[PDB]
Every structure is written in C-alpha cells, then in structure tokens.
Design a protein around this ligand. Structure first.
Ligand SMILES: NC(=O)CC[C@H](N)C(=O)O
Length: 239
C-alpha cells in the first residue's frame, strides 16, 4: 500500500534448502554459460528472489516433464521452466505472479522456401517437446493441417532434428526460438507466433506457500528497482 516504502515484507523460510526443478536447456530461461554453469532469466530471478530474503535454493535441471513430476510427487519443492500458467495446470499447481509473456511459434531451417503457412505443413513432419503447450497446439490442429508430429525430449533435440532434416519444422516457445535466431542459429520463422500465456513459478497446489510468497515478493522488489528489466536485458538485447 505504501508506495514510498523502501523495505520488503518479511517472508520466513521453513526449510534449510528448497529444491527447484527445471528444464535441462531452454535458453534464455535456463542454459549453460561457457563455464558450464546454469544461468538465464528463470535461474537469475529465482536465485535473486531467494537471496533477497535469506532463502536457500538448489536447482535440478532435469527436463520439463521430469520437473512437473518431481513437484507433483513432492520430491521438488517448486519449479521454474518457462512454464505457462493455464487453468488445467492450476488443478495441480499454485502459480506465482506472472513473470514473462510468451507464446509458441513454428521454426523452419534457414533458407526454407516451401513453408509459409500452416497449410504448407501438409504431409510434413513437425517436431515438438512432449508435455508442452506447443504439443497441445499441434495435436489440436493435426486434423486441420495434416502434418505428422514427432515427439522429442528437449529443445536442443528439436534444433538438432530440424537442422539435420529429421523434421521439416519444429514448434517451441517464441522467445526461445528468438534467442536462437539472435545468436545466428540456422532458424527462420515464416509463420506468425501464437501469442498466449504468461510464465509462472510453480509449487504443488496447497504446498510450500512461503516459497511461492518468496518468489512473489522478490519479483515485486526486482520490478521496483529495475533489476527485473536488467536480468531480462542480460539475455535479450533485441532493442
Ligand atoms: N520448458 C518448456 O518447454 C515449457 C514450454 C511451454 N511454455 C509450456 O509451459 O508448456
């Protein structure tokens, strides 16, 4: 309420260490730097939120579906993995305040001339990461456009499959493809993005409320100081 208040609400941890599950490579959200350490928007936001408030977090970069299962089972306390907030997922998870606006998009090989619309995917192969918003879109529209869906395990696997010609196109989150394009990966995006959803930090529904509160209060603080915008701008420098 007090907009001139320069402090923070005190959120008290209840565990010596909270385990945070994540995807294994999903740049710019979580990915390895030159030293092999994981960095990225998700990693920086969660680690800084914890630092701001005396929480200790331990990241496990295990894959998207693995992270979902770990939080559901109680083996991880929370997850961050560029995870879209949806109503269906709210049945299993409590989500933070949204921290990023996203959506999905097709990518094809740089130099591809054939594919300019979804209808051009007729008789083609589209790679996608199992368990994701992209997979849901492709299944919904498979009858309509008449492509075949190939299920892969990671975003790196999508890029590999596309590049060596195992698939004709892939579908993944648009800022992820965009980061790849910005570092000259051989990707093109001839079909407009499907905007939709924001990302959230997630805990199991009804569990670990203070961990969720810690993220929310940290995000508020980082938004107030501009640290949030500096973190994003560390990875996304597209003007
Ligand atoms: N890490 C991912 O692949 C997440 C993809 C998408 N945002 C989802 O929540 O399904």
């Amino acid at each position: 309420e007090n907009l001139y208040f320069q402090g923070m609400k005190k959120i008290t941890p209840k565990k010596e260490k909270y385990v945070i599950a994540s995807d294994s490579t999903f740049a710019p959200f979580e990915f390895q730097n030159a030293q092999g350490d994981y960095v990225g928007i998700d990693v920086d936001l969660v680690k800084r939120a914890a630092e701001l408030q005396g929480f200790t977090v331990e990241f496990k970069f295990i894959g998207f579906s693995s992270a979902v299962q770990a939080v559901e089972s109680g083996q991880a306390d929370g997850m961050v993995a560029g995870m879209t907030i949806t109503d269906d997922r709210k049945k299993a998870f409590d989500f933070s305040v949204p921290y990023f606006d996203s959506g999905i998009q097709i990518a094809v090989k740089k130099g591809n001339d054939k594919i300019k619309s979804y209808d051009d995917l007729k008789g083609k192969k589209v790679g996608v990461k199992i368990g994701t918003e992209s997979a849901d879109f492709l299944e919904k529209n498979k009858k309509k456009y008449d492509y075949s869906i190939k299920y892969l395990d990671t975003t790196d696997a999508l890029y590999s499959a596309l590049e060596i010609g195992e698939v004709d196109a892939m579908m993944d989150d648009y800022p992820v493809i965009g980061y790849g394009v910005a570092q000259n990966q051989p990707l093109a995006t001839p079909i407009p993005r499907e905007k939709g959803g924001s990302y959230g930090f997630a805990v199991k529904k009804g569990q670990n409320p203070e961990l969720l509160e810690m993220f929310n209060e940290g995000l508020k603080e980082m938004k107030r100081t501009g640290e949030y915008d500096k973190i994003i701008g560390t990875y996304v420098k597209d003007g």
